[PDB]
């Protein structure tokens, strides 16, 4: 079958392993455990075609020239997070030489009531690139699904 | 949608299973059989997705074989064992985006067979 490389980035804390392991497993991991790389393989049906999943959990350049497709995830109550966003893009399309790389933009931590980021910037900058911005909770699983979903349809229009 | 399902067997015998559907856009729909030894959790057999591809439990890939009517899916089970012994259920669902080995996927149910 078709097969998706999925490489979540971001700054250390912004909910890179809980995003991964409440959409793969279904469970709030509420646990300090920085990641230096873990990965994924999970089999899942995208519009009707069973497809191969393969997402790698990255530490907050090998890993950039391999993925097919970048979710950029923030933090919304960490700004610097958010500032980094811009940073982890261009060094994407340095590596890979490509200014056509799929790419998601994910602002994570929503339930959480002590946001120093404004989502109206969020989705400028997301709209300035072209490309989608969905709020996240990997605790409540808010936008988990429409994240990884919208990452992999991107993929597939860019593979055909 | 509505599934509805059509028993002893002996050590290295064959047995057909039919999950006929009703109800709107048929088409749409991905279809799983997940089976239940009394007493034990409930695994994952075999599935047909909306486009037609096949996937199987490593337990049974090569034995078993789902196909489909281009209305009924069907659960073709040959050279069983005793392990083979459960509760069978088809199940389906025509979401854009689900792991299809996960019973929380389906939201359609057939009401079961039984497979000794």
């Known amino acids: 079958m078709t097969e998706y490389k999925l490489v979540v980035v971001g700054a250390d804390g912004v909910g890179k392993s809980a995003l991964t392991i409440q959409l793969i497993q279904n469970h709030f991991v509420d646990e300090y455990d920085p990641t230096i790389e873990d990965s994924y393989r999970k089999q899942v049906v995208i519009d009707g075609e069973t497809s191969l999943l393969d997402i790698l959990d990255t530490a907050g350049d090998q890993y950039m020239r391999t993925g097919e497709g970048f979710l950029l995830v923030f933090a919304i109550n960490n700004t610097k997070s958010f500032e980094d966003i811009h940073h982890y893009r261009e060094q994407i399309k340095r590596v890979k030489d490509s200014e056509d790389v799929p790419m998601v933009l994910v602002g994570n931590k929503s339930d959480l009531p002590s946001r120093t980021v404004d989502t109206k910037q969020a989705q400028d900058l997301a709209r300035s690139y072209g490309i989608p911005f969905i709020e996240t909770s990997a605790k409540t699983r808010q936008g988990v699904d429409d994240a990884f979903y919208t990452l992999v349809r991107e993929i597939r229009k860019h593979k055909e | 949608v509505q599934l509805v399902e059509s028993g002893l067997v002996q050590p290295g015998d064959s047995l057909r299973l039919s999950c006929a559907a009703s109800?709107?856009?048929?088409?749409?729909?991905?279809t799983a059989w997940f089976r239940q030894v009394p007493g034990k959790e409930r695994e994952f057999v075999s599935h047909?997705?909306?486009?037609?591809?096949?996937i199987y439990a490593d337990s049974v890939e090569g034995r078993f074989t789902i196909s489909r009517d281009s209305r009924t899916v069907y659960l073709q089970m040959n050279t069983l064992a005793p392990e083979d012994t459960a509760a069978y259920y088809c199940?389906?669902?025509?979401?854009?985006?689900?792991?299809?080995?996960?019973?929380?996927?389906?939201?359609?149910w057939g009401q079961g067979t039984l497979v000794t």
């Open positions: 109800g709107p856009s048929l088409d749409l729909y991905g």
């Open positions: 047909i997705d909306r486009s037609g591809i096949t």
């Open positions: 199940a389906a669902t025509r979401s854009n985006f689900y792991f299809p080995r996960e019973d929380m996927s389906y939201d359609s």
